């Protein structure tokens, strides 16, 4: 059933730069579950877990071709909890 | 804007027994925000804060005429955060 | 990879009484993941999530033939996170 | 330096009944730090850690001569964090 | 009544630079409550909520004329919880 | 007894640069407990408390001769909780 999650919206130079793979790899390292996608208004990252370490490291380790201009966060409800972290 | 909340659904003998006032008073004592209502399928309590102490004390201090048969919890998203605890 | 979990050790009259199914059903209602077993020194419940609501309700809704004499908790590390709640 | 703590005020039949030792033993089992005292308006328990499991078990395992009528909680600031749990 | 809060003390080039408005805007984006002021030893930010995302973004998005040299955090107790985020 | 902790593994130019003292001083400022060591594969920091603010500030305030290339985190269990923060 449902659980509280977090959606992060990351905007900047975040496409064509290895950003979705970067997010994926960071989520793997952090043992996070959810997904990442590029929906045309930046990159959306949905997580089951608290996003703080992820956010710290998103910024600090941003790929060299990428550039993060802003990150927004909001809560949402998972309909079913994720068991993996996937690129969608 | 939005925040993660918790909805509790309390079923049993929970109407005509001072249950909504009891919930209100417990929320006041605990400095909780949200609301309580009876919507015909028990009592729904919506909280901004984590419900655990509230739940402990709901059970332990249940009014004498009342009887709690079950409590369910689920997350939801507040559209605007509550600044009081109110009976609705 | 690994995550912080909680092991609960529940002792009393907790076998032959529907206790493992009771735990399972409570974990389902609470959307918890991990497992339950009877290993000869009571019932061990391992959870991914914080156990507090589970504990409240374990006590309050204890099956009628069962009797809980004590519950102990300790942290441990999951080797892989659970995706279900199962009876083992 | 300072940290956020919780003070619990437990009222009822809570003196002459083994209540301070009971609290101590529960805190030991739960690996909690802080202190307990009887200051003439019930028993005050100060904890470094979140009090929820403690509270659950305070109620469920209340000594037979004791009787808990109410428990109140409030936050406070530790001037120095406790390294033990002690009866004061 | 009272709740646990966090006070952040931000020092550097943090006056005459749009820092209080920057903090305000960040708190709005994050749905945080409390206040900000310049009391002559940097900027003090008092929050109801956990400060971690705020801190991440304080640093990453520091206005161009500003410069953050240090940030300290300590807990404190709110006398009444804030319902807005305001510049004081 | 045991508690959930966090181990951080910090790699880069992190030896001969005042890194262990830097970590120590940051832990003191943050009122953290645990330890730091250099075990030949970077710097390991073990903490009792949640590491997020520590991590934010590790990166932002990295000493000038140092360079942080990566930070990994994993949970572990303390055998006895630390009462100080020490360089080992
Ligand atoms: Cl992308
Ligand atoms: Cl009602
Ligand atoms: Cl069993
Ligand atoms: Cl006493
Ligand atoms: Cl200012
Ligand atoms: Cl080193």
DSSP collapsed to 3 states, chain E: CCEEEEEEEEEEECCCCCHHHHHHHHHHHHCCCEEEEECCCCEEEEECCCCHHHHHHHHHCCCCCCEEEEEEEEEEEECCCCCCEEEC
User: What's the gap in Å between the CA of E14 and the closest CA on chain F?
Assistant: 16
- Decide: C87 and C35 in contact? Cβ < 8 Å: yes
- From which experimental method does this structure derive? X-ray
Q: Is A47 exposed, middle or buried (0-12, 13-18, 19+ CB in 10 A)?
A: buried
The tokens for D6 are 């919780």
Q: Measure the CA–CA gap between F23 and F53, rounded to whole angstroms.
A: 12
Element containing residue D84 per DSSP (H, E): none
For residue C76 the two structure tokens come to: 């441990």
**What is the layout of strands, in order, in the sheet containing A3-13?**
A67-78, A3-13, A43-47, A34-38, A85-87
> Are C48 and C5 a contacting pair, CB within 8 Å?
yes
Nearest listed ligand to the Cα of residue F66 = 6
The neighbouring-strand residues paired with A72 are: A9
Judged by CB atoms closer than 8 Å, whether chains meet at A3 and C31 is answered as yes
Please check if B20 is assigned to a binding site. Answer: yes
Phi first, then psi: give them for residue E48, nearest 5 degrees.
Answer: -80, -35
Q: Give, for F65, the enclosing helix (H) or strand (E).
A: none
Alpha carbons E26 and B70: distance in angstroms, whole number:
41
* Cβ within 8 Å of residue D49, ≥6 positions away: D30, D31, D32, D33
Q: Tell me the CA distances in angstroms from A69 to A10, A66, E72, one per residue in order.
A: 8, 10, 26
Looking at the DSSP bridge assignments, the partners of residue F77 are F4
Q: Do residue D3 and residue F31 have CB atoms under 8 angstroms apart?
A: yes
In this complex, the chains that touch B, judged by 3 or more CB pairs closer than 8 A, are A, C, D, E
- Residue C86 sits at φ, ψ, to 5 deg, of -130, 150
For D33, phi then psi, to 5°, come to -130, 145
Instruction: Give the Å distance between the CA of E48 and the centre of ligand 5.
Output: 20
What is the number of the ligand closest to the CA of C40?
3
Mind giving me the DSSP string for D39-66?
Answer: -SSSEEEEESS--HHHHHHHHHT--TT-
Ligand nearest to the CA of E44: 5
Helix, strand, coil tally for chain A in percent (to 5): 25, 40, 35
Q: Which residues of E touch F30 (CB under 8 A)?
A: 73
- Dihedral over Cα of E15, E20, E21, E27: its sign: positive
- Min Cα distance A12 → chain E (Å) is 13
Which domains, from first to last, does chain A contain?
1-88 (3.30.70.100)
Helix (H) or strand (E) holding C87: strand C85-87
Which residues from chain B sit within 8 angstroms of residue D59, using beta carbons? 56, 60
Residues A37 and A19 sit within 8 Å (Cβ to Cβ) = no
Angle between helix axes C52-60 and B52-60 (nearest 10 degrees) is 10
Q: Is B39 helix (H, G, I), strand (E, B) or coil?
A: coil
Angle (deg, nearest 10), helices A52-60 and A19-30 = 140
Question: Within a 10 A sphere around the Cβ of E85, how many other Cβ atoms?
Answer: 22
CA of residue C68 relative to chain centroid, distance? 12
Looking from the CA of A35 toward its CB, the CA atoms found within 13 Å total 11
Resolution in A: 1.3
Q: Are the C-beta atoms of B45 and B86 separated by less than 8 Å?
A: no
Beta-bridged to residue D86, according to DSSP, are: D35
Contact residues on chain E for D4, CB-CB shorter than 8 A: 4, 75
Residue A43 DSSP one-character state: E
B81 touches chain E (CB under 8 A): yes
Q: Do B1 and E81 touch (CB under 8 A)?
A: no
The rounded Å distance from CA F43 to ligand 6 centre is: 6
Residue A72 backbone dihedrals phi, psi, to 5 degrees: -115, 150
Whether the CB-CB separation of F82 and F35 falls below 8 Å is answered with yes
């Amino acid at each position: 059933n449902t659980s509280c999650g977090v959606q992060l919206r990351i905007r900047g130079k975040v496409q064509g730069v290895g950003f979705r793979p970067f997010v994926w790899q960071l989520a793997q390292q952090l043992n996070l579950h959810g997904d990442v996608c590029n929906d045309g208004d930046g990159v959306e990252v949905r997580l089951r877990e608290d996003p703080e370490v992820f956010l710290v490291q998103l910024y600090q380790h941003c790929p060299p071709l990428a550039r993060i201009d802003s990150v927004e966060r909001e809560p949402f409800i998972w309909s079913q909890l994720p068991t993996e972290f996937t690129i969608r």
